[PDB]
Amino acid sequence: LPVYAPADFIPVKGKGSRVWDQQGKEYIDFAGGIAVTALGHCHPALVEALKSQGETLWHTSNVFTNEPALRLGRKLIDATFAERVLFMNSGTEANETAFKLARHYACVRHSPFKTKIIAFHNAFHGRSLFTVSVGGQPKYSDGFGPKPADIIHVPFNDLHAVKAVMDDHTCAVVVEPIQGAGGVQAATPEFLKGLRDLCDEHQALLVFDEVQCGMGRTGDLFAYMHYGVTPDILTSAKALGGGFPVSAMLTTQEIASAFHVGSHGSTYGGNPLACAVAGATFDIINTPEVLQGIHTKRQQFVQHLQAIDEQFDIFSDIRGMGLLIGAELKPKYKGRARDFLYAGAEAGVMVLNAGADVMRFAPSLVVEEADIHEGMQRFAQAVGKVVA
Amino acid sequence: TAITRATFDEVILPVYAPADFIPVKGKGSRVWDQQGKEYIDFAGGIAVTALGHCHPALVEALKSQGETLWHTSNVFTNEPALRLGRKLIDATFAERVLFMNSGTEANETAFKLARHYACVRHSPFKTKIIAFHNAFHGRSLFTVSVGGQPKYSDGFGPKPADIIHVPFNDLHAVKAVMDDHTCAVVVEPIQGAGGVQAATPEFLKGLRDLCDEHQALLVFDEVQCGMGRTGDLFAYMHYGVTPDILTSAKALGGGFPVSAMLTTQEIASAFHGSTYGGNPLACAVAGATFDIINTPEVLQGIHTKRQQFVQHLQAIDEQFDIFSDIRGMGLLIGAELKPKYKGRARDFLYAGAEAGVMVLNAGADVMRFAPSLVVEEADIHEGMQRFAQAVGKVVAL
């Protein structure tokens, strides 16, 4: 089931979209550490922000505020629906904050009995007990003792099923606008708008988990902007820090006001070092030029994947948005995603899976055209070894 | 627009009430705000900056690894993670280490591991977790439910079940609630947040014996009391009681977000390399931190420095009659306020800040200090004189 590297593949150095291991073997990185290094490895602007803030102040706790956090909060507020933010360390933590907030808001504004959370089969929201129970893979939430209750799962993209389970006792709908791990499946426009309308009807909060699809990944700053559907709460991580552990939960003042002093917290969350790095990342990703390039680069990848399919006949579908790319394997290659991944690594290209039937790509948003061509040539060679 | 204290209220969720001032720079145990006012730091960002601010060795590790490789996913290991794992394994009971970002995440991992180990090695019905009143284990739904402060776990909908709370240091109560359906006892060897209360020796040894009797795992949350804080590398070493699982964070990265779950191979095998995970950058910094903290000289110094603080707190009490008890271990110090000042810890914290010294509380009745483990003697004396002035100002009123 899980993908792990053997003892002879230990990454030691990265620069841009290239990675070297202990043996000095060079790889083209189309995986980004699972869509994390959205500006590649050791990006000079990010290294500069790390080093300069690293000389000044790393940590003070939430007994205090700090300038890099306030600067970053201001940027996120100015660029999105958000009016308030909370910074944490990981996507899992941001989701914990979001889910607790949706629960607490319902409890204090409506009723302590308004507790149901609707989530989706194959969703991934993290590995904490609560977040993995909201996630939609029972294999990952089984076996840890009593799960937090009042979570209902229905199929992704099934609006009827959502309408059927939702009621006045529902506090939230939690959804990834594109399910990254779950086969790179994008919400349909009708489905996502439908969720907004149902949450409005039932006075439930719409929570978008944009940990994977946010911060430029789709070619808009956040996937919600592509759809034009505004959530009540949004979570962000991964690309937000370009490899530095940082995350954010975004909401409105009206919702945030349900939290009081002590309702939530974090030792490291809102760390000046993290926020200086995320500020630098944000300044680069949130530019017309970088967002446009994500679309150009997507089509460069897609054209290679189509060429590979023309030669080898291995894909049934190429999907995703921006530089989150899914390539679904044909029935003749069902369950082979891991083998194409390992073959890719032998050929010097790092890719991902999205379940056993789907190849996933999540390269740097600024991956050079020459790296796209070189890495896709390597991938084509790996494909040739698997099938030919 | 300039960034002010008012900016906080316009930007962050209202879960904190931060100080009037905004620290912009730190070096060692001194910190400066936007106005260039200089403070002595006896708080350490809540026991996190264990080597002070911008320690040259930690800055060097950050910059060196920062120009090399920051990030791998958990598919991979990396040299800094391997090195740090080896250091932790060599120095402790651990045979396996899993790295995460925060103390909350390390505790999630520990509690899920104790649960899953029971499930697969004993019975899916062996689920009870025993924890303690006033415990603090983090803010995720699971960890805050294992935590012993209902105020923090109420109001988020259905809590993960099968968690039983009894009083800290009450061994009989533990004996009474434990049974063959118990998977774990979770305990902070010293409850930091909970008034700086240390386990008694008989209590902690008692937990080990009861866990053995009932085939449950003993989980030590050393997020706050670990990584040198007590003057041993981990508090368990002071006590001579070996847990099955231990969690570490805060001091581990000296200010960089990093955490660790330590256990044996037998237990770790229930999860389906001696190390798992670990951000390269985080682990490089934590490795540099470990290299300094795990030295005879630094660990001895922690005890010297504790007595320098304690002598000051004693002098303050002699002059102002404010403390009923001075407690904790190493450079985790609690000073309990006398009944006349019950509930007024925040007043002394604010007066401290006005006087230019950063301190903590541990509930409304207890002052808490958690300075850099290498805080200079000159800073201890200066900061404690500032604190004496703050106490003087409060008591004069």
Ligand SMILES: Cc1ncc(COP(=O)(O)O)c(C=O)c1O
């Ligand atoms: C949609 C989604 N949410 C949450 C998470 C958890 O984030 P983290 O791994 O930063 O804890 C992930 C990680 O893959 C993700 O893909």
Ligand SMILES: Cc1ncc(COP(=O)(O)O)c(C=O)c1O
């Ligand atoms: C004993 C203990 N455990 C766990 C935590 C949670 O750590 P974090 O805030 O890094 O998630 C804390 C934080 O204060 C703590 O004191």
Ligand code: NA
């Ligand atoms: Na806004």
Ligand code: NA
């Ligand atoms: Na060992």
